[PDB]
Amino acid sequence: MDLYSPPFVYLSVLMASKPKEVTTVKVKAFIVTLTGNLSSSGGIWSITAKVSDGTAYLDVDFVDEILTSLIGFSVPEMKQSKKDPLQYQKFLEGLQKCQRDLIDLCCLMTISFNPSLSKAMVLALQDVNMEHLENLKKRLNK
Amino acid sequence: AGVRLPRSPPLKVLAEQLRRDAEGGPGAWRLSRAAAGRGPLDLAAVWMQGRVVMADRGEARLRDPSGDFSVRGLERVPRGRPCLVPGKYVMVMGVVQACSPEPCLQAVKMTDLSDNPIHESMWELEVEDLHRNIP
């Protein structure tokens, strides 16, 4: 099994391939646990987690862009919202939506795997579609 | 915070696979792959999916395409979109407590998959595909 085989590959297969360099793969995964709080340090959002695809556990960080899109607010927008109660109330709403979305997250994750640090960055999230179903049928020779 | 997880990953399985292929016992569950001519898989943690057909406090019974399974301890797991009512399609991460007459899990997470029906279309194929790629 190829690391480019659609619709997704497996972490256990990635690790067994013993990659020397940082490697992009797409896996279907959920968050087993978060491993830190949401952080805005550095001027950007980050949060660490352990995900599983059913074949392995993987420490990951999520990119700012993903967390901005779940919350509805960038770090600058969050800071600006502290300047006005009505806007800050909207950020709190966005934060609850994000917390919930991380709890329920189960999707295709494009991840950048650093084999030296045994961890990865999640670059993008994608929901499954009928093409994914068709690719899985084709891979199972059906 | 300082977290602690099952030693092994949540393997994707179907109810019938537990019901009929599991052996060993509490705390030493293993799944037979004698049919596919391969060695036992270790079975603490699982990833299972189904339609909720019964909900009662923190227990649920769920139906996947192969059969029913139970889940205990849902009052303890993270609450996302509420989905512990009949009709919801959900995933469960759990630990295997019994395999027959009816598979039973201790719940670690349960999360809603209802808002995209394509999860349900894919699930049985996912189980099969994952099983093919474990040596």
């Binding site: 978060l34 | 602690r4 997880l5 630990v95």
Partner: peptide, 13 residues
């Protein structure tokens, strides 16, 4: 077992 999602979750092992 223990998970964290903005609060701790204690589960039986």
């Amino acid at each position: 077992y223990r998970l964290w999602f903005f609060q701790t979750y204690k589960l039986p092992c």
